[PDB]
Design a protein around this ligand. Sequence first.
Ligand SMILES: NC(=O)c1ccc[n+]([C@@H]2O[C@H](COP(=O)([O-])OP(=O)(O)OC[C@H]3O[C@@H](n4cnc5c(N)ncnc54)[C@H](OP(=O)(O)O)[C@@H]3O)[C@@H](O)[C@H]2O)c1
Ligand SMILES: CCc1nc(N)nc(N)c1-c1ccc(OCCCOc2ccc(-c3c(N)nc(N)nc3CC)cc2)cc1
Ligand SMILES: CCc1nc(N)nc(N)c1-c1ccc(OCCCOc2ccc(-c3c(N)nc(N)nc3CC)cc2)cc1
Ligand SMILES: O=c1ccn([C@H]2C[C@H](O)[C@@H](COP(=O)(O)O)O2)c(=O)[nH]1
Ligand SMILES: O=c1ccn([C@H]2C[C@H](O)[C@@H](COP(=O)(O)O)O2)c(=O)[nH]1
Lengths: 547, 551
Amino acid sequence: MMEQVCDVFDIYAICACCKVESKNEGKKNEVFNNYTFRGLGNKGVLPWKCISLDMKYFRAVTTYVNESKYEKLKYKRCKYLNKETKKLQNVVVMGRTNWESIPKKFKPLSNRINVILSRTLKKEDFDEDVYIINKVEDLIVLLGKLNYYKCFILGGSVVYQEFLEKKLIKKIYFTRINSTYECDVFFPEINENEYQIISVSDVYTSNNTTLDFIIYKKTNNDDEEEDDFVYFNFNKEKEEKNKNSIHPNDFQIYNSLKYKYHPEYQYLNIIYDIMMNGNKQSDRTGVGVLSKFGYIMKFDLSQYFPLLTTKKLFLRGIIEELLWFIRGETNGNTLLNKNVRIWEANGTREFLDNRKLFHREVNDLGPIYGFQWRHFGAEYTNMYDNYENKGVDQLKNIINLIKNDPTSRRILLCAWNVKDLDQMALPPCHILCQFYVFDGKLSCIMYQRSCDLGLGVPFNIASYSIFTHMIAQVCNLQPAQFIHVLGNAHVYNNHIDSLKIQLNRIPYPFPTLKLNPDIKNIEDFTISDFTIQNYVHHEKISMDMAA
Amino acid sequence: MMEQVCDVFDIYAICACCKVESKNEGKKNEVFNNYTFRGLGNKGVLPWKCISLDMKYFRAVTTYVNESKYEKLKYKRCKYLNKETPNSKKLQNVVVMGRTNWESIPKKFKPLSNRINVILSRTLKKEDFDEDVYIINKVEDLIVLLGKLNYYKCFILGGSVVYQEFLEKKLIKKIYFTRINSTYECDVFFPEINENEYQIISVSDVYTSNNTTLDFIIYKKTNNKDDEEEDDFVYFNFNKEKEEKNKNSIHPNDFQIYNSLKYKYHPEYQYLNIIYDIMMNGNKQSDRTGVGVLSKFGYIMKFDLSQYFPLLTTKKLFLRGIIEELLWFIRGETNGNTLLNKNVRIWEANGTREFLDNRKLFHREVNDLGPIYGFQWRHFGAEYTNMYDNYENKGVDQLKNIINLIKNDPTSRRILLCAWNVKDLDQMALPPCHILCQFYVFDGKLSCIMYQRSCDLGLGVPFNIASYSIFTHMIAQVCNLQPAQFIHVLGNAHVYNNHIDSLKIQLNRIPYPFPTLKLNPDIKNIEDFTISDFTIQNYVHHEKISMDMAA
Ligand SMILES: NC(=O)c1ccc[n+]([C@@H]2O[C@H](COP(=O)([O-])OP(=O)(O)OC[C@H]3O[C@@H](n4cnc5c(N)ncnc54)[C@H](OP(=O)(O)O)[C@@H]3O)[C@@H](O)[C@H]2O)c1
Ligand SMILES: CCc1nc(N)nc(N)c1-c1ccc(OCCCOc2ccc(-c3c(N)nc(N)nc3CC)cc2)cc1
Ligand SMILES: CCc1nc(N)nc(N)c1-c1ccc(OCCCOc2ccc(-c3c(N)nc(N)nc3CC)cc2)cc1
Ligand SMILES: O=c1ccn([C@H]2C[C@H](O)[C@@H](COP(=O)(O)O)O2)c(=O)[nH]1
Ligand SMILES: O=c1ccn([C@H]2C[C@H](O)[C@@H](COP(=O)(O)O)O2)c(=O)[nH]1
């Protein structure tokens, strides 16, 4: 309860950490944690040539002040010391090595009170307007004397260490750089009982890496139109709905976070919203769900590939599926021969016979995505027929309107062929997608009529994200937004335990997708023209706990 | 005058006002304004038996206190008067109501629980009463009782007269004004509010209570004469544009009444804010028609049909054409003349020789619109020939199928009605904008999503909202369910360059509470509806706007 230094004098640490080159630590079964991000420097410079968005973030935090909050901080600080009574600046503190690695033309740091820690070096040795100190104790005395907003520790491996050892840091402002480099200095392992994440930013691309910004907080061990809001909330109900079956104690960490801006939260929050406010319902499968109806998610494919990080996911299978679609295939055996089993259960003798498809060969799935994308309208015979120049080739159509009529509002691909639903092994979930083109950029809306949140939505996001990059590249456009519209959104009763676990995981920065740039026609991609870079993830989860 | 009277003592009016029956006019050609809502009382009661949500609200606005904001208010109060006024353990609000008003309440609920009650009169005095209650005699005598009392905020309940005067004399800071959207006979009316003194700053959601709609609004007195994580917020915003892009074509000063309002909770703002987003941040693009648009991609609107019918009130819309279009669609029709011989011109331009010829449909008769929505709803996949052919029992009767699925398998996720038939697209006059709707059922209630590939926000979307909101009602009734939500998903969402000026006007108007839709309850099959089975009640609206202001 009694006041600790770091509160009084508002001491904070700010770092940028990349991932560190290790050989023989097989990228095949790499385990990932908070400590994955820990690279501060190499040979006395930064690990990376120039990540300009961290530079800009860094200057923004370390130079920002609120004059109208200064009086409060002064009272709070004078009242601590049994005392009383140009522009306000922040103080910044750094070690000697750090300072010696910054070029003359940038020191002393503009618009900030610079302070060096150093046993050896001394003040007669500096031309510059800078404070020298030789014990952390001396910084306290100094902050006592100066007029300043906030104090920031800009590091040094060693400086971070001891300010963290002595609990002097009230918050860490940590940039996770999602890229690997050669490093010789490292950020201390953070004690998860002393510091815990309270905030996560949006994910960005700068200079060919993704990255985000998190905040650790130290763990405890007119003002009038505010009544007008209360008045409007007068119809604030009894309590919640699933406050009986689902406990908000089950999401301790999910809820501990103040700012949850990482876009993986457009998925996670929908999950939480169905758990807390789902409608309880039977379904075709019998298993049962909580459902709601009608959501939209948006992913900026210019900044990142939205491969969920709160559990593991592999893409081989869904790319093959995507290429099978494009090829116009309806033969289930093609996929089983590549050890992809996404459609295995929909093409068994027993399954087909439940659909009343008695005269259908095993693994002949009928007029499904592939067939509708390349031959909408044609009469389906069997999966081995030659269907060339039969039906409407929707796919070639929309590649031509994107290239030649980009302002068209009719660039749609539709799998929901009312006349063939009954002949499909089963009716398509991804009803359709619509394209939009502006300024050499392609965005894509995909409407999903039925959305298994636990297990299928994650893959589906990835699936139509990749498909958007493919279309954009064969049309000489850049991808912009994949937009995911969800109709019947539901969580299956057997996913609830895995999903309670998943929503208490904190996201990592997303990876990026690279396609072989040489592929100029939608029909010419192969599995090897696709690479996933910098996929950092939590543990695989078994969405169902029986198997 | 160094701090204002009403400011210091926190004087607030709270009222509820219904509409009033004029005698012999014509109600589908009447003008509306803020004044449309005046009716206070009749024969010394409420004009309405009981409106329960306005009671809940009225008590919570008068009973609600915040102990911890009091210091700042006590401080600035005693400071004004030049004095220093421990008491009733819980702090309480003053309520200030004239005799007529006091005398027309029942004494079972008197005085008003958890409120310092006051009264005005010259017929009564302290002695023939409780010590609890107070009474004054003039206006200026009130200010006096307040400063010599512990109270949070003071609320004029008044009466015609009490409101009438307090408001002459500039002693009201804010009016909490429930607009009750029905009509009743009234003797006693709330006064015309001067606009140069008071302006609306906040408008609530729209609700249904005891078979009427209503919203709560707030007028404000116009000027005449852990902050830990507030920074954390500022640091998360480090990468923002210092500029709106279409601020060179479309200026925020062109939106002064839209941006004035603090809380804009009325459901119509879901449409108006989309328009705003487009005008400020949209993308300059050309299109097929050659007018050019500002466009964006992907939005959701949601409308609670259980609480209101969402017919836009910031401009005038009519519904006969779009209902006859709905009925034409349900019947399977593709003949354009059926609508022209009822003077519905919705599909006229698309059935011209000229237009059909431009679609390369040279062997199609005028007004044969091809295999459009109707045909696909009732005969999806059949061979189209001409608008007079007989299609009984050909194609898939999607409309029939979804009705059976809602009734007999309501938890299906395959209840969809699709009009985008890839095989027939080029045979259609034009391809459908309303790609599909999907249906969802829970606890005896039906909701509908509709996906729209192309959305003309200025002219089309308003009719589209209403059109599928009716349809959702129609399907719900013939499957013995209650409408819940209509959800409208927009794809290519565009504002036509010629509509910019008109929308600027429109976005600067303040919604009225929404009307309601009534269907004849005998109708139990989707084929049996006729025009006469649909009644719009209590449509209050601004004046018509020609969106094209060329003619
Ligand atoms: N990416 C990032 O956010 C980030 C942040 C910081 C640093 N870095 C990198 O890491 C490198 C330096 O790492 P480092 O930890 O070896 O250098 P450092 O911690 O910046 O500075 C070490 C020096 O500061 C002094 N010092 C530390 N604690 C002290 C105390 N209690 N009293 C007096 N003096 C004290 C000592 O000065 P004497 O030598 O004079 O005793 C010591 O040599 C840099 O060149 C840079 O590339 C990166
Ligand atoms: C921007 C790097 C960074 N990001 C974050 N988030 N936290 C930090 N503590 C740091 C950090 C700050 C200083 C530091 O000193 C080691 C020296 C190598 O780092 C440099 C050197 C020069 C510059 C530089 C530059 N390249 N260009 C300009 N204009 N100004 C500056 C100085 C602010 C930036 C960092 C190391 C890390
Ligand atoms: C609650 C109605 C209302 N709403 C709003 N928004 N503003 C107002 N000024 C008023 C209001 C207007 C005039 C008025 O004057 C007397 C005529 C009202 O007659 C009443 C009022 C309340 C009740 C009543 C009731 N029926 N039930 C309870 N529990 N408590 C009460 C006392 C408020 C019965 C009759 C009282 C309140
Ligand atoms: O890519 C897919 C494919 C299938 N499903 C799910 C949704 C439903 O749980 C089930 C299909 O159920 P029906 O909607 O066909 O009833 O499969 C997905 O979520 N994503
Ligand atoms: O019910 C309708 C019908 C049409 N449109 C508009 C959208 C476009 O402005 C135009 C159709 O143009 P294309 O998108 O087909 O080019 O009509 C609507 O908004 N609602």
